[PDB]
Amino acid sequence: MITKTSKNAARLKRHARVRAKLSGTAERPRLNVFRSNKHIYAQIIDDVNGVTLASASTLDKDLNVESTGDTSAATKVGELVAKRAAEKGISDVVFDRGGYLYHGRVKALADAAREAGLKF
Amino acid sequence: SKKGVGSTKNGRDSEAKRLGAKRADGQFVTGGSILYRQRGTKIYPGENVGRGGDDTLFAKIDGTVKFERFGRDRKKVSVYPV
Amino acid sequence: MRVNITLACTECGERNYISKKNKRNNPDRVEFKKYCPRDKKSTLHRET
Amino acid sequence: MKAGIHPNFKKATVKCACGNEFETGSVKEEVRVEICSECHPFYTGRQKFASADGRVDRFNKKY
């Protein structure tokens, strides 16, 4: 037969393991990461209010990149995360690597936000 | 006639440990005070309630106590302020 | 067999700690780094 | 692939005694084979020797 469950089903389980231990409180919004094959996405979420505050995707026709899956695409969408997080003033944020490792594009997002000034 | 039979084999028993609710719903409750003595988690900790090493439910802040429910068939202690 | 174990410091030589270990599963002299309040830091301790 | 664990792999030039050559990748650099698939008689349809041989005895009246 051999059948496989999706990347996304195990990804949501391993994300829900992460979500039991850190949340999007007041004055610590949750910095979530979604990591599609053709793009990458990053939101800044209140989990108490149910509201994402700022957002950034490589699906942005302004400030686009070529590769969109490169570490430079993740670095540019991370600097957009931190720039919108400074423009709408949360100023302190909690990094939700979302059911992934802290390895590649996700770590590129996180390092770009740490450089640009989001204090994890 | 006095015929000798003995040997019960079932005398002993342990000391009663006083599990259960120590505070109620709508009770004013200070910080650090034990809300529920249990073994296992018959009832879970919610907001401002911690689970101890001997899985006791205690209040983290001052405030009233509410026993709500965890959805399917499962309960919860939560402490709110005023 | 199970033995009561003191874990004396090395920088100070002071005892400061007790835990148990086997004489068979740990036949050698065991060592840990714990806190010496005379030394006020983490310090390598040693079974005595 | 883990390093220092697996043996090497070079392009095996598998031969055969019927002359048919074939290509894989193995530990051995070159392999000579005495009976391949196209040499073995089961792969070659209804074979010559054993199928021509395997007629059961026709109640051997002949003499």
Partner: protein, 176 residues
């Protein structure tokens, strides 16, 4: 190299128009090949595990796992652990090379070879070759062989029903 190109080019249009799929992705593909060893003489012969930790590294260079018994069995004189049997999993290019070794090179050397069974499909689309002699394809070297201990090969397609895995494995080259 050659079995991937043979499979894609000749087989995938032919098998796709043999079973009339409504898309190219419904065509079954051989996903993995799992080579079991199953040497349980580790109890009475403690060294023997290294036999086919040696050999299955030579059968396919992916090193097998020294696999352990998951439950203690008194009738087999065996506690839980004391590892039993080796295991190779296989997907990539070496595996089509391995079926190239089996079909074109090895399975002639089965010294009593006839039609290997039609009746070795589980009902889901998967196949097993049961091997009893460990020297079939010429690397095994009679010189380095004393124990003849054979092998279990689990050829695992992605086929959902069974007879289309049949028509896959006939076209790959397995005789029946």
């Amino acid at each position: 190299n050659r079995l991937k190109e043979k499979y894609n080019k000749e087989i995938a249009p032919a098998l796709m128009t043999k079973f009339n799929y409504d898309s190219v992705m419904q065509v079954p593909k051989i996903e993995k090949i799992v080579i079991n060893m199953g040497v349980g003489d580790a109890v009475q012969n403690a060294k023997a595990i290294d036999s086919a930790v040696e050999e299955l590294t030579f059968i396919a260079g992916q090193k097998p796992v020294v696999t352990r018994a998951k439950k203690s069995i008194a009738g087999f004189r065996l506690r839980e652990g004391m590892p039993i049997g080796a295991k190779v999993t296989l997907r990539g290019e070496r595996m089509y090379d391995f079926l190239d070794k089996l079909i074109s090179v090895s399975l002639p050397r089965v010294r009593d070879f006839r039609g290997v069974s039609k009746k070795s499909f589980d009902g889901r689309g998967n196949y097993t070759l049961g091997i009893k002699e460990q020297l079939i394809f010429p690397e095994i070297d009679y010189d380095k062989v004393t124990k003849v201990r054979g092998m279990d090969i689990v050829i695992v397609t992605t086929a959902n029903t069974d007879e289309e895995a049949r028509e896959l494995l006939t076209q790959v080259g397995m005789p029946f």
